[PDB]
Amino acid sequence: KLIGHEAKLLFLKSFQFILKRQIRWLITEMRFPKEFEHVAKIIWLKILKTINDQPQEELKLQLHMTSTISILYLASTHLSLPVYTCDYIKWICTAKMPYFQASEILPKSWRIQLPNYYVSILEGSISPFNGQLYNKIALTCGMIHFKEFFNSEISCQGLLLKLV
DNA sequence: CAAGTGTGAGGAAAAGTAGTTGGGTTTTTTTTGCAGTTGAAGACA
Secondary structure (H helix, E strand, C coil): CCCCHHHHHHHHHHHHHHHHHHHHHHHHHHHHHHHHHHHHHHHHHHHHHHHHHHHCCCCCCCCHHHHHHHHHHHHHHHHHCCCCCCHHHHHHCCCCCCCCCCCCCCCCCHHCCCCCCCCCCCCCCCCCCHHHCCCHHHHHHHHHHHHHHHHCCCCHHHHHHCEE
């Protein structure tokens, strides 16, 4: 039950939390060592950097259900391990991601952290429409300045194989 | 043929809050024994 800046801070925090839970199932499923884990961290460390700057009372951040996978997608692309469609289908099919419902957290309490123009909107609101999927991957790249930072973006001779 | 600024709204969701009701205490301001006695109507010198 918190409104305003600090409501945002833990909405921030919770967002922080689930992405991390997302990443570790990431490792278990793909077993792609420290590497997958740490690149993902700093990626959001980088994402956080900008959020603090336009703070004051900037509440444009609260990321969408999609921002998290865009983040993991961007980081993977760095690592260039896989593909998007395959990743998305696999994730939905096995609920590999905690993406769908936001009750996990470790919140019990973050849940009650009331919603404050936030936390309630997190975890499992809806399924992606059209580009919409990327309509934010691009934004994240925008926030990130990702292309300069990370090598070989979107590539994969593996998507071609997957496709044939 | 084609690419590019400016921008209004549509939509979602948990909890609150509405309407309609009821419950709910609350809260509350037929003589059966006795003995005596008074007053009565009636009566009298």
